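ASSEMBLY PREDICTION REQUEST
Request ID: AP-0331
Submitted by: J.K., bench scientist
Number of chains: two
Total residues: 427
Priority: normal
Notes: Please return the full assembly, not individual chains.
Input sequences:
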Amino acid sequence: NAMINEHYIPQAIILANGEYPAHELPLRLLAEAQFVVCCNGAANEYISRGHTPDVIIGDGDSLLPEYKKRFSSIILQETNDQTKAVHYLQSKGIRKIAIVGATGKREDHTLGNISLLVEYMRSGMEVRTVTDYGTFIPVSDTQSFASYPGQQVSIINFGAKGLKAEGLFYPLSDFTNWWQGTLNEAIADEFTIHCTGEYLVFLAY
Amino acid sequence: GVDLGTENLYFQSNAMINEHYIPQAIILANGEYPAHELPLRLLAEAQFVVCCNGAANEYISRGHTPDVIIGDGDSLLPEYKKRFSSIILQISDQETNDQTKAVHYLQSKGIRKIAIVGATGKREDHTLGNISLLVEYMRSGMEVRTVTDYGTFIPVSDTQSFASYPGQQVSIINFGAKGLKAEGLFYPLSDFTNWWQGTLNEAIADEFTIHCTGEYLVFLAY
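STATUS: Completed
Returned structure:
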């Protein structure tokens, strides 16, 4: 596995139906996107800010009629919209994606959206969720990460066993409850997590 | 007994009750300040408010008076630290999560029924940690709810009935419970292995009951 770095350039962006991004990073990613897929809606918010989506995932009654006379051709048809967006992009040979706007509204939607990341990667997709506060990266087995000393790192386990690290302030164990692995800290310019199985890393900006 | 779910939060309940939810104390955590009428109702009606670091800044700026401030005084605006220095408590030099320290402070005071507001909406790792901690607080013997801008999280053990309304969105997050089954929900339950699986179920009627052994979390959307 190649080292996970900050310089992430995805082939496509998914704009999910959580809170529209406010931080510079997700906003820049959206602005310089090669391909944008909008979930339900999010398309209305995206268009109102003077942007143009490539694909809209929803039921046809998603867009405002006012925008429909301009983007009815790019609307496309059960799971959640984020997952449908991932699967659509996967069907087009896209392998590298960032999701923005996936959090910050209903918390059950936030929880669902985050948990699905681990499932996308096992399918063979490279996906990251970029928020106003950090980046979620689904991982399996041994993985190295670029960091800076003092960078806050949270680890949430998804069934992985034998978790241990170098380059983090606190040692790891096979976490269960979500709080257990949160609010660790990088002590150097890189850290490596060793295990077998799936887990999720949140790197705070 | 039956947990009234969100039905004891609304100004006008479907449940033919003569009261509403008034916990013994409110914790204002350090996520986004409540914006929705329901967590704001709890805050407005509270006679004991514990502020986490910071969270006290917005509370004070809106003209309100914390009863206790948990954690680092340095997280306060200088004038606020000066105004409230005598109610700043560092309950532990080991525990670092202020939400947890607030719960522990209230428990030592002999308080058991509490609501947490402002726990979510900023850094998502704080959101995830704060939510998951509800299971620990319940285990410790506290009756605790987290009340957000969008619904309420209730930590649960074993069999539990909830008041509801037809079409209410109900999400179940598993924390090691086994034999999950329900009456009164649209979708049959399974022993959920990932968070999304039990989300966005739906109450059919005015009550539902979840049966199992072990711990889980229920989110009821307003």
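REVIEWER COMMENTS: The domain at 1-222 of chain B is CATH 3.40.50.10240 (Rossmann fold).
SIGN-OFF: pending second reviewer
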